[PDB]
Design an enzyme around this catalytic site. Structure first.
Site, short mmCIF file in Angstrom:
data_model
loop_
_atom_site.label_atom_id
_atom_site.label_comp_id
_atom_site.label_asym_id
_atom_site.label_seq_id
_atom_site.Cartn_x
_atom_site.Cartn_y
_atom_site.Cartn_z
N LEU A 1 -8.95 4.02 2.46
CA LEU A 1 -9.94 4.69 1.59
C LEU A 1 -10.81 5.67 2.37
O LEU A 1 -11.43 5.30 3.38
CB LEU A 1 -10.88 3.67 1.02
CG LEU A 1 -11.97 4.35 0.22
CD1 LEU A 1 -11.38 4.95 -1.07
CD2 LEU A 1 -13.08 3.35 -0.09
N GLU B 1 0.80 -1.22 0.00
CA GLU B 1 0.00 0.00 0.00
C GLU B 1 0.84 1.27 0.00
O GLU B 1 0.36 2.32 -0.41
CB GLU B 1 -0.87 -0.01 1.25
CG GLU B 1 -1.91 -1.14 1.14
CD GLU B 1 -3.01 -0.92 0.13
OE1 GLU B 1 -3.80 -1.75 -0.12
OE2 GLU B 1 -3.03 0.21 -0.50
N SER C 1 -12.16 -19.95 -6.56
CA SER C 1 -10.82 -19.91 -5.96
C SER C 1 -10.89 -20.27 -4.48
O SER C 1 -9.92 -20.77 -3.97
CB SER C 1 -10.17 -18.52 -5.99
OG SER C 1 -10.08 -18.01 -7.32
N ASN D 1 -6.76 -19.77 -11.24
CA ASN D 1 -8.11 -19.17 -11.16
C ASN D 1 -8.17 -17.68 -10.67
O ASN D 1 -8.92 -16.83 -11.16
CB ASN D 1 -8.98 -20.04 -10.22
CG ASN D 1 -10.45 -19.66 -10.34
OD1 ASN D 1 -11.01 -18.91 -9.51
ND2 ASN D 1 -11.04 -20.07 -11.45
N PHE E 1 -8.43 -6.61 2.70
CA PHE E 1 -8.12 -5.23 2.98
C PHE E 1 -8.23 -4.38 1.70
O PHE E 1 -8.71 -3.28 1.70
CB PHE E 1 -6.66 -5.27 3.52
CG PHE E 1 -6.16 -3.92 3.91
CD1 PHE E 1 -5.60 -3.03 2.98
CD2 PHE E 1 -6.22 -3.55 5.25
CE1 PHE E 1 -5.09 -1.80 3.39
CE2 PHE E 1 -5.64 -2.34 5.68
CZ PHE E 1 -5.10 -1.45 4.75
N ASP F 1 -6.41 6.64 -5.14
CA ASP F 1 -6.41 5.20 -5.47
C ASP F 1 -5.82 4.97 -6.81
O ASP F 1 -5.97 5.78 -7.72
CB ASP F 1 -7.88 4.55 -5.73
CG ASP F 1 -8.18 3.93 -4.47
OD1 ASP F 1 -8.60 2.84 -4.29
OD2 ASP F 1 -7.98 4.84 -3.55
#
EC number: 3.2.1.17
Length: 164
Positions: free
Chosen positions: A32, A11, A117, A132, A104, A20
């Site tokens: 966010l 991040e 998945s 996948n 997250f 973003d």
């Protein structure tokens, strides 16, 4: 390596409101603030989140606090989710971190939509699941990060993050 170090690599850290990969207003370590287009809505959310007048800027301290909350919320979200919990419980410590990272970034909801998945991870079919997971908007939009997470689910070791 641990969940915090992992996510902090993915991040980054920014002490000023920023957008973003998605164009959304964020601050700190991927926190966010709003999906709305006004810098003003974002500023308002920020001040609400920190409990002070920040004028679009926070300290390192405040950034890590938000980070602690976000990680805690992600884990508790997994634990409360009927779809997520069983996968999480079935996983080893390293792969658990990979699931957390996805939650997250994309929220409980988004990840719980990766039905097939999820199934494969529960089954410990590591290679199938990696194939996948890659067939997703997620992987196409943020390939370097998705590939680090995917390798982590594949291998169960932290090499993808050693480089970094």
């Amino acid at each position: 390596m641990n969940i915090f170090e992992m996510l902090r690599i993915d991040e980054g850290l920014r002490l000023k409101i920023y957008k973003d990969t998605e164009g959304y207003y964020t601050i700190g370590i991927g926190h966010l603030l709003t999906k709305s287009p006004s810098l003003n809505a974002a500023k308002s959310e920020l001040d609400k989140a920190i409990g002070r007048n920040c004028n679009g800027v926070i300290t390192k301290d405040e950034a890590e606090k938000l980070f602690n909350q976000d990680v805690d919320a992600a884990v508790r979200g997994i634990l409360r989710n009927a779809k997520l919990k069983p996968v999480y419980d079935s996983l080893d410590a390293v792969r658990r971190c990979a699931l957390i990272n996805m939650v997250f970034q994309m929220g409980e909801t988004g990840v719980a939509g990766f039905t097939n998945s999820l199934r494969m991870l529960q089954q410990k079919r590591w290679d199938e699941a990696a194939v996948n997971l890659a067939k997703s908007r997620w992987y196409n939009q943020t390939p370097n990060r998705a590939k680090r997470v995917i390798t982590t689910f594949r291998t169960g070791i932290w090499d993808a993050y050693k480089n970094l």
